[PDB]
From Swiss-Prot:
Expressed by the venom gland. Keywords: Disulfide bond, Ion channel impairing toxin, Neurotoxin, Potassium channel impairing toxin, Secreted, Signal, Toxin. GO terms for cellular component: extracellular region. Belongs to the short scorpion toxin superfamily. Potassium channel inhibitor family. Alpha-KTx 20 subfamily. The chain holds residues 28 to 56 of 58 of the full protein. Has the structural arrangement of two alpha-helices stabilized by disulfide bonds (CSalpha/alpha 3(S-S)). The lineage of its organism: Eukaryota, Metazoa, Ecdysozoa, Arthropoda, Chelicerata. This is Potassium channel toxin Ts16. Blocks potassium channels. Transmembrane segments: none annotated. It comes from Tityus serrulatus.
Amino acid sequence: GSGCMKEYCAGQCRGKVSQDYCLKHCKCIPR
């Protein structure tokens, strides 16, 4: 995919940096 996919990352995780973490790591950002 594009990292992971930009579609998938907005369908699972929210906000620019959280979605950017999914673009790097195929998961949502930790707290």
